[PDB]
Amino acid sequence: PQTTDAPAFPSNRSCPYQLPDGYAQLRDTPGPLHRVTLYDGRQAWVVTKHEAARKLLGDPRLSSNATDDNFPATSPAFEAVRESPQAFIGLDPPEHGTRRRMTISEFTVKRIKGMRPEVEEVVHGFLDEMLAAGPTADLVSQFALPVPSMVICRLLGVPYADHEFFQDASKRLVQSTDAQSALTARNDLAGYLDGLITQFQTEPGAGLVGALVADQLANGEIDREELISTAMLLLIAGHETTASMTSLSVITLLDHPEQYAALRADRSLVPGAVEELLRYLAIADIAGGRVATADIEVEGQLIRAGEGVIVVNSIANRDGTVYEDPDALDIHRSARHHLAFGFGVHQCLGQNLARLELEVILNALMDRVPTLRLAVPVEQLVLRPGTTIQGVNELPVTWHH
Numbered sequence: 001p002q003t004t005d006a007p008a009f010p011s012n013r014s015c016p017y018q019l020p021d022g023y024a025q026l027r028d029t030p031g032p033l034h035r036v037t038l039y040d041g042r043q044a045w046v047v048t049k050h051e052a053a054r055k056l057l058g059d060p061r062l063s064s065n066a067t068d069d070n071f072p073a074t075s076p077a078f079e080a081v082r083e084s085p086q087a088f089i090g091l092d093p094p095e096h097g098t099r100r101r102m103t104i105s106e107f108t109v110k111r112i113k114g115m116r117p118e119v120e121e122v123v124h125g126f127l128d129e130m131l132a133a134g135p136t137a138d139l140v141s142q143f144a145l146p147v148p149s150m151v152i153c154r155l156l157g158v159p160y161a162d163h164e165f166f167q168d169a170s171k172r173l174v175q176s177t178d179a180q181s182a183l184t185a186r187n188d189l190a191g192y193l194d195g196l197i198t199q200f201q202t203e204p205g206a207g208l209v210g211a212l213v214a215d216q217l218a219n220g221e222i223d224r225e226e227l228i229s230t231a232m233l234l235l236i237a238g239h240e241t242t243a244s245m246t247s248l249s250v251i252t253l254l255d256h257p258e259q260y261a262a263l264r265a266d267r268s269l270v271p272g273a274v275e276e277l278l279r280y281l282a283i284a285d286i287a288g289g290r291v292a293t294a295d296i297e298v299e300g301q302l303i304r305a306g307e308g309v310i311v312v313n314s315i316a317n318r319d320g321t322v323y324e325d326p327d328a329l330d331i332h333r334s335a336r337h338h339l340a341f342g343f344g345v346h347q348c349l350g351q352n353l354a355r356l357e358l359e360v361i362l363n364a365l366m367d368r369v370p371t372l373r374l375a376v377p378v379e380q381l382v383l384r385p386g387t388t389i390q391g392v393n394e395l396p397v398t399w400h401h
């Protein structure tokens, strides 16, 4: 027999908004942890329950150090992370905090509120272009990706002019299946960001990157390579996550036409619906890799120092002890406390920006294209595999022209 007690991980979605069969199995298995086998044949733990996920994401014994030999890399591409200085996503206290604090001013509640008119302007701008061209469009390339790309570019002070280049490099890096393809795309982005830094040293400019160059870099409080990594982190997260959420959300809402109509009829529901969609879709479900620096006992199971642990937030967000009937989309439910953005010191920096963008996007689509529908069968869409940010690279849509 082929039965194993350490199943291959990650697994692929076969339905854009449902756990892969293997994740459903792990969700159903009693206890906080379960053994898996990574791509290289090393075993690691996955965390498969909601409260245990919060506990372990809060445990300083679980390091985010992606350079550790025992870090649970889920594919060969991750070499692109371990081969350069880490952005703060890969740091632990105290270095984590000193780096994260250099960026937090761009993401304050007050700043997010202040970006509402810009995000609304950008959303409607790309809509009026898409709709003026008329039906059979790819929602990914024409809307889902350019909108948050333009927004994060202004926040960072990266020229939107260069979008074709950095969007292509972003995709190759994040979606690469092999180490050399990842290293190249990372190197391409690095050289670009490097030139931007030098440009800012000659002529000060707006945006976070400009601010970091003029201040912390000039004081030697951040390494040039760290600034590159930090900018690359924010550029890619700023783009890809919201893009993925937009496309997946349209697919999922259109498969739930009853709740979609309800959303349209009562816009006060959109913020809650956005939380439910974040819970349900969990697009960064394997962005929870850690390595134990010390033994950790977990409800009778022992994680040993030097063992890898992945906090699987998709599985955790389907914990029925927390979300009653967890596999049912319900935009009226309280999706509060979900783990789509992590928990603790590395909890998503961009979360409130994501929430603003998705609220504006949903309202705009319902306002401007109420007859939006997919132009192909859900079954014919190609879903990205489990080793990356979840989503689709193409989304054929049409509407009443």
Ligand code: HEM
Pocket (backbone or CB within 6 Å): 064, 088, 089, 090, 100, 152, 233, 234, 235, 237, 238, 239, 241, 242, 243, 245, 282, 283, 284, 287, 288, 289, 313, 339, 340, 341, 342, 343, 345, 346, 347, 348, 349, 350, 351, 353, 354
């Ligand atoms: C749109 C949906 C998004 C999802 C589902 C999401 C998910 C996550 C998750 C699960 C983590 C934690 C990773 C860990 O614990 O190792 C994270 C961290 C992070 N995310 Fe988000 N993200 C989203 C949007 C954004 C946006 C729009 C940005 C803007 C740049 C952003 C920036 C970051 C950064 C900088 C971190 C690292 C925080 C730290 O390590 O201190 N994210 N995200």
Ligand SMILES: C=C1/C(=C\C=C2/CCC[C@]3(C)[C@@H]([C@H](C)CCCC(C)(C)O)CC[C@@H]23)C[C@@H](O)C[C@@H]1O
Pocket (backbone or CB within 6 Å): 072, 073, 074, 075, 077, 078, 080, 081, 084, 085, 086, 087, 089, 173, 174, 182, 186, 229, 230, 232, 233, 236, 284, 286, 287, 288, 289, 290, 310, 387, 388, 389
């Ligand atoms: C942007 C950065 C870089 C790489 C990001 C990648 C490449 C590999 C796969 C990653 C890490 C994606 C995976 C979905 C996350 C898998 C996480 C894990 C290995 C724990 O299951 C998200 C972003 C992707 C390069 C780094 O130098 C700066 C910044 O860091």
